[PDB]
Symmetry: C4
Subunit: 31 residues, 4 copies
């Protein structure tokens, strides 16, 4: 209902960090 800020923008940011957590661990575990 709030057009001030769509959840897509916020979700995109959250996903970015989330991926880093998984990607970061993958690097540590495997090269």
């Amino acid at each position: 209902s709030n057009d001030s800020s769509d959840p897509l923008v916020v979700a995109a940011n959250i996903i970015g960090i989330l991926h880093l957590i998984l990607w970061i661990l993958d690097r540590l575990f495997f090269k």
Copy 2:
């Protein structure tokens, strides 16, 4: 025509998830 929200922002978010789907599968298939 609508300057309220550019497609670039929306597309960027979609791409993020899209990449995760491919990247996620790659990890499962190969380390």
Copy 3:
């Protein structure tokens, strides 16, 4: 000078795709 849209948002989107091009090729060349 234009506060309508910052270049950071546009650049971020461009970078996303750009990375995919390099990342995509890397997968094809190496698993």
Copy 4:
């Protein structure tokens, strides 16, 4: 206090490039 632009958007952009720096080096060091 400034609703003109949230730090999440700016941070997201910074993270994108930051990840590339680490990801780019990883590729150079290891395939």
